[PDB]
Design a protein around this ligand. Structure first.
Ligand code: HEM
Ligand code: HEM
Lengths: 727, 727
């Protein structure tokens, strides 16, 4: 019965469309023409559906999938209904354990390619040739919340890339900030328990704003650097496309001659850096908890492919000890003012998965998954990570054969003597399951290390020391990097940092914890410490006021690359504007608005007080994307109000509040013709005001001012005006 | 080390304290004197910590829990660090699969007691004597969202009670609405797949506002009754304390004489019925996703024990076919006007768990867990459920010995010949593991049924009919219950239902699904259909406008027990009031205010523009609980603004928005003396308006008036006034 509409409107066109234009869909149906080697290799397990009979898992066609088998139509269900039991059994067993950390994440397929050969510094096959493409799978995530938690929380973001190389899988498992909270992997469970929901009541979700987190931070000053990053606007990215990525640890690059080069991995977002503001972000976890997931999926459906530039910070082996911080300390960043990021390659994400569970939920990444040409270092955090991902994957994915789960399979060859385990897919025909063997003539065989296609051989680092459970004395400095980060932020980024600490500490119930954290802030910067202290009604002591600031990092008093906004990096493609309609829209304004939006690749969402349609003044029928309350200003980058019958929406509560929220969250607002009467709602300016575009009509000039503002992301100069606005 | 603050303020007082007064804590430390047989029976697995050495799981004391074992303090981590590896290993394996449905839940311990012996209608031991106390463990839950999703979503709520009786565990696994969406358990996976996040991208979380849900609903009219309940304010309860609970299915009570009586189970909230309004609820999922979990826990820490009255709808076996609907159809409710609820007992929830994971996460409820004196019916939804819980628990909880997980264990004896299985705790000494046996003289032995303490025997219901996969023709009526529900709601409740449907259908991207739902509503009631159509820009056709309404339900054109608010049942105890402070509060208003709230068990939270303290006019130091932005109006039931230096907060955007938000969400507002300056913020006339308490001071009848408003929960008459208002 229940079938598709005759018009065929149930199914999304298989071409790039803007967000909201068509129902989203599985990647292979949205873009059948988008391929890569990994994408094709999943064809063995893709399952269609159209034109096939509904069956059991054993392939028996089902006649009636609406009812259980019973004795009489009002009778008891019979034990012999095998169809019902298989159906209910599969359903009952759908869930698998979520990841211990990063349970909440959104993923996509894509490809990578180096800009030039890196064979002088590394023998890594995937970095050897500019025209050799490496398929990737990337998962972006939060850290604390569960898989059903919200996206736009304040938290670190994970940025894990699986490279399916010709010489093995390489997982670059990083975050959106260049350092981690702790130094040694042994304290991982401690740190994660402290930030996770408190054990008695399992509160709070997706938030570090609770006593245990701040307790731990107050007693472990090594966390202060990543805490600064987390409290800044870096903790609430606008999108996964507009954040940086970092491997955090110093790893090693090994060339064909055996030379080791220390390296730190970087991802540069080609859509630029951009973050939300706290109020927006918090409210957005309620209005659309799947905001980042959605925005990623829709950007890929629209052709706005998330693009990132892989970059390398390279440090000669001889310079290991030349900085004032240890290179192997993951709570320390390497300032770009000291070691520049060399551009390495471009990664493009151009296809969503088909089934989230099968591909995203079951994906397994591992920082230990390196290939010849890469090696580890003694970073003590990194070191414990090598152990942990392997271990957790055995229960999360039910056994040792998780590399056989389609998304995780290498696309290159893999042969060894490992056998059995739960859900073994591969059926080995090798007479031998051990080596050395003579019965299969010793195949598969070991391969000597070499310049290309050689077996893995660890870089022979010299190890000298006693067996000790001891932190390096060189790791015992906790305040200079926090201070370097603080001084590198613009004045409005600094204010946001203060507000993040003030908000969070206000949620800490035990007041002494707040004081200890303030005391820690006093060792970083007195201005910062005093601003937070004032917000918490706390008075710094005389001693606290005489704490000497930490030294500069190798002479640096600031590093502009640590700021999200000091250096303009503004790209509007992929952004989205709310267009607040009325029932007699000036079609001339609209045509002009969409033409300029379209030239810059900026999307629009047409909003009204109801759904359905409204007819413009020239008889153009405009489908409504959502209502003013249905898609709040939180979900867009700027708001445009075209002329027309403004009286239709002039007294609309939601339409007015729409602008007040957008204004409070520093977003550009453009008002044409009679739409300018809305300036009274945002009680501000009479002539004009920077951030508010106004004109008699929406013209070329009007749109260029708007797009220029959008390229600056937010109207920071309006900050002083917002705290009187009641919104 | 010795890190606690000398002063002992890290530890909350072990006595009832209002929400926010102390840090929350494990139940057994917070209320050590609150005991019951089940709580005392868990003492064997409770583990302390104070004054013990930190050890591995094998009991080896740990000297250094800050570092991994390495070769040299900057060297590589060694594989021989077994302390590191056990710690990380346990951490890596912390998670277990969340519940397939109802993953998000909040639980508490309590006790149950019958008002009188029910021996005449059931031989169930827990209902046989008013002095027989039964320990309970209750879990409240949402349905769709993961364990990390938000609490105040729009959804059905679960209300599961584990009764640890003397003759076996009895679990009553119900919901907060008296019917379910579907008729037969075979379609559970279909319905759940439809409401859960869509399979390509896993969006949206905790929400039925998406295409697949409404698609299913539009093709399966049986779902319409429960959809109406969910679309009403029933789907967004104020708290688990203020919602009704229901078993849904018709079960049987069996007395000692063998007589079977049909029964539907009810839970009446002794704190009354109360729900949020959609905008508040959605926003509250962002501002505090743990709001319900928190409120439950803090209610219990405060001594406001959630109390419910067990009630039975009883129907003689001869009246099975006397209604217009089938009693075995779970999409049909039994109108209380036809079959009153007889009061059976009281359940008081008076202690929080110690560890959420161990007690809450691992709790396994099952509607098939019945005891002698109860029995099932042929309800086809119930029939399938009996299979599902048993099955799901074997993977969720790792094996068939989940009844040995402390929280799930019976408090009464349990002996059988079942053996082994993962995680087997009981060591059986029985020489026999089979029966009949002579080697243990057949023990343990079967027990014949009898009036008390006898074996379970099913009621000998006559079964007659062919083995068919068929829906009973008596279940094929879908619109009359939906209509009865609709007509029983107040006008403001009806608008909320219209708004819930409109909002949700606005998020369905495929317009034809919206139209199809509208067509279904037009089969329920024309006013409902037209109002929703209008909000979606849909016009009903002339055929739709003449669909004849479904018949009344057995002569009833309304039943006021179906409304949340038609019949007052307001209880203010445990509610909370926001108090907006200034820097010179009139201390006399404050004494008056705080004492009056305290007298009715109404909590308060003193809010300001910063944390720390404020000093009243007489030198009284007032501790600030949170900022205006920190504990928004969403979290409180009412707002009071005392006299003082109002100019301190008059131009504070957050302070003004605080009142706009509370005013918008129909909450009582009380303004003392110069706090009447805020009247212009929320547009109140000089004369005043119903719902706003105002006077020169908080003396005389100011608090009694405010409290009368709080007893009626929300100011429904203000609805038309909120239409406009930019908030
Ligand atoms: C530099 C510091 C770290 C970074 C950048 C980092 C990054 C990440 C990311 C991005 C994920 C999610 C991958 C996905 O999307 O599936 C993840 C998961 C995980 N992390 Fe790490 N992490 C760090 C430290 C650690 C440490 C110290 C440990 C334990 C010693 C650890 C144990 C885990 C585990 C067990 C998982 C779950 C993996 C799975 O279930 O497949 N992480 N981490
Ligand atoms: C009257 C209809 C139903 C009601 C009132 C109901 C209620 C509930 C509640 C309250 C829970 C969670 C208990 C907890 O808090 O642990 C739950 C879980 C569950 N429900 Fe039901 N449900 C209904 C229908 C069904 C049906 C028809 C099925 C399948 C045939 C089903 C399968 C499950 C499963 C598998 C779980 C998870 C339990 C676990 O992992 O322990 N439910 N349901």
């Amino acid at each position: 019965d229940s079938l598709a509409p005759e018009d065929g409107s149930h199914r999304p066109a298989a071409e790039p469309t803007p967000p909201g234009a068509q129902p989203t869909a599985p990647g292979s149906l949205k873009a059948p023409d988008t391929r890569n080697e990994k994408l094709n290799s999943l064809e063995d397990v893709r399952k269609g559906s159209e034109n096939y009979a509904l069956t059991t898992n054993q392939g028996v066609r089902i006649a009636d999938d609406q009812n259980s088998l019973r004795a009489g139509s009002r009778g008891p269900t019979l034990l012999e209904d095998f169809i019902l039991r298989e159906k209910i059994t599969h359903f009952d067993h759908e869930r698998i354990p979520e990841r211990i950390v990063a349970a909440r994440g959104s993923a996509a397929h894509g490809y990578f390619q180096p800009y030039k050969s890196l064979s002088d510094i590394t023998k890594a096959d995937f970095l050897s040739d500019p025209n050799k493409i490496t398929p990737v799978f990337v998962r972006f995530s939060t850290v604390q919340g569960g898989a059903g938690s919200a996206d736009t929380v304040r938290d670190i973001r994970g940025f894990a890339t699986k490279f399916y190389t010709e010489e093995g899988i390489f997982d670059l498992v990083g975050n959106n900030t260049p350092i981690f909270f702790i130094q040694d992997a042994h304290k991982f469970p401690d740190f994660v328990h402290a930030v996770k929901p408190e054990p008695h009541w399992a509160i709070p979700q997706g938030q570090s704003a609770h006593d245990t987190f701040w307790d731990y931070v107050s007693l472990q000053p090594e966390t202060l650097h990543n805490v600064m990053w987390a409290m800044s606007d870096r903790g609430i990215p606008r999108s996964y496309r507009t954040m940086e990525g970092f491997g955090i640890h110093t790893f090693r690059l090994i060339n064909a001659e055996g030379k080791a080069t220390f390296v730190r991995f970087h991802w540069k977002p080609l859509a630029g850096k951009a973050s939300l503001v706290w109020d927006e972000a918090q409210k957005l976890t309620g209005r659309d908890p799947d905001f980042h997931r959605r925005e990623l999926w829709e950007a890929i459906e629209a052709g706005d492919f998330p693009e990132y530039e892989l970059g390398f910070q390279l440090i000669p082996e001889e310079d290991e000890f030349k900085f004032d911080f240890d290179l192997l300390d993951p709570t320390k960043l390497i300032p770009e003012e000291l070691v520049p990021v060399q551009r390495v390659g471009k990664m493009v994400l151009n296809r969503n998965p088909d089934n989230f569970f099968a591909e995203n939920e079951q994906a397994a990444f591992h920082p230990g998954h390196i290939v010849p040409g890469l090696d580890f270092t003694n970073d003590p955090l990194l070191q414990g990570r090598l152990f942990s991902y392997t271990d957790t994957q055995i229960s999360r994915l039910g056994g040792p054969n998780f590399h056989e789960i389609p998304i995780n399979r290498p696309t290159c060859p893999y042969h060894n003597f490992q056998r059995d385990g739960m859900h073994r897919m591969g059926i080995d025909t090798n007479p031998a399951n051990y080596e050395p063997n003579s019965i299969n003539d010793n195949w598969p065989r070991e391969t000597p290390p070499g310049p290309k296609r050689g077996g893995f051989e660890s870089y022979q680092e010299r190890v000298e020391g006693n067996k000790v459970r001891e932190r390096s004395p060189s790791f015992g400095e906790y305040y200079s990097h926090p201070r370097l980060f603080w001084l590198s932020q613009t004045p409005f980024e600094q204010r946001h940092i203060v507000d993040g600490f003030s908000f969070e500490l206000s949620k800490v119930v035990r007041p002494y914890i707040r004081e200890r954290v303030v005391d820690q802030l006093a060792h970083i910067d007195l201005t910062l410490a005093q601003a937070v202290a004032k917000n918490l009604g706390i008075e710094l002591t005389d001693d606290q006021l005489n704490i000497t600031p930490p030294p500069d990092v190798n002479g640096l008093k600031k590093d502009p690359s640590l700021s999200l906004y000091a250096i303009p990096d503004g790209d509007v493609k992929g952004r989205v504007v709310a267009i607040l309609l009325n029932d007699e829209v000036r079609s001339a304004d609209l045509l002009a608005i969409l033409k300029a939006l379209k030239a810059k690749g900026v999307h629009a969402k047409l909003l009204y007080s109801r759904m359905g349609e409204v007819t413009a003044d020239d008889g153009t029928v405009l489908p409504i994307a959502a209502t003013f309350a249905g898609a709040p200003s939180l979900t867009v980058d700027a708001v445009i109000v075209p002329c027309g019958n403004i009286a239709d929406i002039a007294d609309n509560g939601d339409a007015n509040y729409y602008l007040m929220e957008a204004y409070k969250h520093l977003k550009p607002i453009a008002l044409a013709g009679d739409a300018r009467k809305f300036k009274a709602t945002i009680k501000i300016a009479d002539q004009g005001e920077e951030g508010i575009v106004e004109a008699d009509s929406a013209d070329g000039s009007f749109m260029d001012e708007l797009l220029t503002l959008m390229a600056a992301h937010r109207v920071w100069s309006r900050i002083p005006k917002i705290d009187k606005i009641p919104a």
